[PDB]
Scaffold this active site. Structure first.
Site, PDB file in Angstrom:
ATOM      1  N   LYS A 156      82.983  50.366  66.906  1.00 50.38           N
ATOM      2  CA  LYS A 156      81.548  50.141  66.985  1.00 50.38           C
ATOM      3  C   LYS A 156      81.011  50.614  68.335  1.00 50.38           C
ATOM      4  O   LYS A 156      81.767  50.925  69.269  1.00 50.38           O
ATOM      5  CB  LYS A 156      81.307  48.668  66.710  1.00 50.38           C
ATOM      6  CG  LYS A 156      81.778  48.156  65.349  1.00 50.38           C
ATOM      7  CD  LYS A 156      81.473  46.720  65.139  1.00 50.38           C
ATOM      8  CE  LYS A 156      81.769  46.313  63.718  1.00 50.38           C
ATOM      9  NZ  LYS A 156      81.486  44.897  63.494  1.00 50.38           N
TER      10      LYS A 156
ATOM     11  N   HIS B  67      85.372  47.631  63.120  1.00 48.66           N
ATOM     12  CA  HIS B  67      85.408  47.231  61.717  1.00 48.66           C
ATOM     13  C   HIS B  67      86.648  47.777  61.034  1.00 48.66           C
ATOM     14  O   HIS B  67      87.025  48.888  61.282  1.00 48.66           O
ATOM     15  CB  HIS B  67      84.243  47.919  61.023  1.00 48.66           C
ATOM     16  CG  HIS B  67      84.344  47.868  59.537  1.00 48.66           C
ATOM     17  ND1 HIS B  67      83.911  46.815  58.777  1.00 48.66           N
ATOM     18  CD2 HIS B  67      84.924  48.715  58.654  1.00 48.66           C
ATOM     19  CE1 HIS B  67      84.212  47.013  57.494  1.00 48.66           C
ATOM     20  NE2 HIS B  67      84.796  48.182  57.397  1.00 48.66           N
TER      21      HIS B  67
ATOM     22  N   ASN C  14      81.852  42.812  68.403  1.00 44.66           N
ATOM     23  CA  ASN C  14      83.257  42.586  68.102  1.00 44.66           C
ATOM     24  C   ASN C  14      84.063  43.874  67.851  1.00 44.66           C
ATOM     25  O   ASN C  14      85.097  43.850  67.152  1.00 44.66           O
ATOM     26  CB  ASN C  14      83.428  41.594  66.962  1.00 44.66           C
ATOM     27  CG  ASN C  14      82.986  42.155  65.637  1.00 44.66           C
ATOM     28  OD1 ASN C  14      82.456  43.264  65.543  1.00 44.66           O
ATOM     29  ND2 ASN C  14      83.230  41.394  64.595  1.00 44.66           N
TER      30      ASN C  14
ATOM     31  N   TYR D 167      76.909  47.678  54.755  1.00 46.16           N
ATOM     32  CA  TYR D 167      76.780  46.240  54.931  1.00 46.16           C
ATOM     33  C   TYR D 167      75.946  45.610  53.805  1.00 46.16           C
ATOM     34  O   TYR D 167      75.387  44.530  53.981  1.00 46.16           O
ATOM     35  CB  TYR D 167      76.177  46.017  56.327  1.00 46.16           C
ATOM     36  CG  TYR D 167      77.126  46.189  57.510  1.00 46.16           C
ATOM     37  CD1 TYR D 167      78.345  45.512  57.561  1.00 46.16           C
ATOM     38  CD2 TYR D 167      76.805  47.013  58.598  1.00 46.16           C
ATOM     39  CE1 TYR D 167      79.210  45.653  58.638  1.00 46.16           C
ATOM     40  CE2 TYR D 167      77.659  47.149  59.683  1.00 46.16           C
ATOM     41  CZ  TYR D 167      78.875  46.476  59.700  1.00 46.16           C
ATOM     42  OH  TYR D 167      79.765  46.589  60.753  1.00 46.16           O
TER      43      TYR D 167
ATOM     44  N   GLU E  75      84.438  52.564  51.306  1.00 47.07           N
ATOM     45  CA  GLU E  75      84.011  52.913  52.640  1.00 47.07           C
ATOM     46  C   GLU E  75      84.486  54.320  53.010  1.00 47.07           C
ATOM     47  O   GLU E  75      83.791  55.062  53.667  1.00 47.07           O
ATOM     48  CB  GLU E  75      84.569  51.888  53.628  1.00 47.07           C
ATOM     49  CG  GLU E  75      83.854  50.549  53.536  1.00 47.07           C
ATOM     50  CD  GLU E  75      84.440  49.370  54.288  1.00 47.07           C
ATOM     51  OE1 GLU E  75      85.418  49.565  55.034  1.00 47.07           O
ATOM     52  OE2 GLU E  75      83.894  48.248  54.117  1.00 47.07           O
TER      53      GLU E  75
END
Ligand SMILES: Nc1ncnc2c1ncn2[C@@H]1O[C@H](COP(=O)(O)OP(=O)(O)O)[C@@H](O)[C@H]1O
Ligand SMILES: Nc1ncnc2c1ncn2[C@@H]1O[C@H](COP(=O)(O)OP(=O)(O)O)[C@@H](O)[C@H]1O
Ligand SMILES: Nc1ncnc2c1ncn2[C@@H]1O[C@H](COP(=O)(O)OP(=O)(O)O)[C@@H](O)[C@H]1O
Ligand SMILES: Nc1ncnc2c1ncn2[C@@H]1O[C@H](COP(=O)(O)OP(=O)(O)O)[C@@H](O)[C@H]1O
Ligand SMILES: Nc1ncnc2c1ncn2[C@@H]1O[C@H](COP(=O)(O)OP(=O)(O)O)[C@@H](O)[C@H]1O
Ligand SMILES: Nc1ncnc2c1ncn2[C@@H]1O[C@H](COP(=O)(O)OP(=O)(O)O)[C@@H](O)[C@H]1O
Lengths: 152, 155, 151, 151, 151, 155
Positions: free
Chosen positions: B15, B121, B118, B55, B132
């Site tokens: 990210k 992913h 965080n 998402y 994905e």
């Protein structure tokens, strides 16, 4: 272009096979350079012939092309002040025998033909290599939160 | 697959906080040292469109808008890794969604603090991974190469 | 209990994957004392004895053949609770069950290529140490760090 | 809660084993903010108060005398859930119980030589920070990485 | 000469980039003895004195203001030839001239953001240590590794 | 040799200070990551005898007795490494005899301070390596194995 200078770097097939991609990337990140393009590719011989066109009369040219085409490479563009010259210092001499410890080739390589990584030799070479390997929409512009701590 | 399982693939993405904090190499090295095979990789600026699809299951959570805006806010390193049980194993290497619950030794346990920053992913399931990978990569970006290391990772 | 010893071996995959130093460093950093070390090619006969308890298991033949197929690094480490603690550092037999932070959790995928052997008990350690090493290969040394590792 | 603070100290064994940098790097890489730091030698009087909750434990005297015996690196770290998370990074009191990946799991063997102290609660941290540091030793600084650690 | 001491400081960019622990670990792994340490914010008055040799240089003013702008980690390290050797570990003033393997060569790009200060000589070190530290902040401890670093 | 040079061998030893300071793995990892092939390894308590012969050349140096006593003062890790130009390269990786002259990035430059406690020995020449290997190892301790990594280190 000063702090906006860019260089082309590529992890050669041996770097991918030997699981040194992250190690190499981490050295450029820790130095302060900005990663602006990155991809895993398999280069065509046609592309690699153009890439190494200056070396076309050298006896190793054919096998260099064949080898670089033989497996995946990680192509990258890094940005920062004097990034071309400084990247070449981080990488070390062409022949790893001449590359001191602390350089990438000095730490990880033995032979000229298996020397882990390519970096552009000059800003003009970098311009040519970046255009060869990357489309413009693959080159990202982002605001570096570290830049105040790396530059005046 | 089922042949041997060794060609399972997961989608992993660093990210924007991982790129900004200069953790790309550290993250890639953890997957390399584990023995997984990198079969796709690119740095991208993800469109809000793509992220809304990514998402979509979080479409009616309160954070949804800030998540999408944030994931579009800077570069992401998109990857596909291959190997036996790579989906489940990659989730273990990453750690819990909330870093506060991710043990030391995991990526989130070692490197981050808050659920909204965080670092990474990873697909949560084989079906999620299929979806994905297809969303983020073209077929021609997924490479077939001969892994010299496989002999020493697989029985 | 500070003189307890275990037998560890880096399996042929650890040698081939250039993880010998990484593995040794983990036991050094934990505080254990290295008291024996050698690079050897183990015979199938030695390995059949080492893994005798597994002789009825379907995988025994290939385990033996594999462990004999390339060099291994045989080691003895010494310190308080070294046998059990070494097994914790190594992680579960099946790397799928070994958490991150363990040797197998960080570096391995499959049960058949799981990098390292450690004794499973003090009595197993005694047996394995005697099988792999002569008494004159087991060294005694005074650890300058011991005051900082033990109460 | 991002302004929560904890008190951490590298114990004499951490300094003697040359692990100060390693420990600090673990907290930096996690994303916490270092707001106080000093190398000190604490008095028994200060340490008796630091560990006053343990005054009836049979090891209290030994613990105080040991922690006064050599330099320690006193620190304050700031960030969300820093107290609880720091304890997780450090690992179980007894290193035998601390998994690999934790500080004690990676580096220690015995409870008496367990490298580091961390506050056990927000209220204990407030007390410990006050005990060890003058108010002017805690520094406010603008964290360039804050936007990438917090939402 | 093993009691020689140098003054080192991690500059604000090293703190902000979360390189404190990396820097400390490099001096620890070398074998030098940490004898003083603190996180501080220095006054312009102190820094003008620190850098008084540079007072006619065009960058003097901005250097002083910058070093006063945020926290620094002040340190004193002890060991044989520690002043000269520390300078070698740090690398050339301009990171463009500092080889890989040095702090500046590994971590920095530009002269104004060059991570760390180290004394340039034994006499400069004496002056700097006195300027930044009180005598009671320099600790004498018995170094468990000294027998393995020195003759 | 002169076929390709790739079977050249050097003798390396981690001295007692390297054992005591817990730098054995660090040292071995530097040679592994460089690509050299480990062909022999053992931990030994070297006898005053072997050492007098190891350092025969230094017999007239005033430190000779103190060198032999020190090299017997704890365990030594004796090694043989193989590869192209391994004798010269290993000396470069270790750095100058006097650590104060060894640049950062070398073993001695990174990890030690004084000439008398300088962590490691490497053969200074091919002929020295021949002699040292013979002195410290039996022929049956030098192993012939198939190096999966050679394909990626050699053209
Ligand atoms: N004598 C040689 N034999 C084989 N390969 C060579 C030789 N010289 C150069 N090469 C290869 O060609 C690549 C490109 O050469 P060059 O651009 O001159 O070096 P560098 O990559 O250090 O800039 C080298 O990185 C190396 O892999
Ligand atoms: N409670 C929350 N608050 C803020 N952001 C959250 C929260 N839960 C999840 N997120 C964000 O949404 C992402 C996707 O959530 P989810 O799929 O549940 O977790 P994971 O990424 O561990 O699989 C998380 O990684 C995190 O970035
Ligand atoms: N199901 C299996 N298939 C293949 N090899 C196995 C299997 N179970 C165990 N082994 C191998 O046998 C070795 C010895 O088994 P065991 O002593 O039970 O485990 P450990 O090494 O974790 O103590 C294991 O480390 C592994 O390499
Ligand atoms: N049984 C014990 N024997 C010796 N020392 C102990 C014992 N239990 C605790 N200690 C020491 O006392 C310190 C303070 O104890 P406690 O606060 O209970 O643990 P922690 O430091 O993990 O929060 C421990 O870190 C350890 O050094
Ligand atoms: N030309 C310059 N421009 C900006 N800052 C400079 C310049 N030259 C030196 N400096 C700064 O001044 C500090 C002190 O200079 P000096 O003592 O000469 O170098 P060093 O820190 O390597 O011993 C340097 O570390 C650097 O941060
Ligand atoms: N001047 C000295 N004083 C003390 N010990 C020394 C001195 N010179 C060398 N030694 C020791 O003797 C060893 C052998 O010396 P030499 O062969 O000259 O160095 P090297 O090991 O780098 O080949 C050194 O590695 C060091 O341990």
């Amino acid at each position: 272009t000063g702090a906006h200078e860019r260089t082309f770097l590529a992890v050669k097939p041996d770097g991918v096979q030997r699981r040194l991609v992250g190690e190499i990337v981490r050295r450029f990140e820790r130095k302060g350079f900005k990663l602006v393009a990155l991809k895993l590719v398999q280069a065509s011989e046609e592309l690699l012939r153009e890439h190494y066109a200056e070396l076309r009369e050298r006896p190793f040219y054919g096998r260099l092309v064949k080898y670089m085409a033989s497996g995946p490479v990680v192509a990258m563009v890094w940005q920062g002040l004097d990034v071309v010259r400084t990247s070449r210092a981080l990488i070390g001499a062409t022949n790893p025998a001449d590359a001191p410890p602390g350089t990438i080739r000095g730490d990880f390589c033995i032979e000229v033909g298996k020397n882990l990584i390519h970096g552009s030799d000059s800003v003009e070479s970098a311009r040519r290599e970046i255009a060869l390997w990357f489309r413009a929409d693959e080159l990202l512009c982002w605001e570096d939160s570290a830049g105040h701590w790396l530059y005046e």
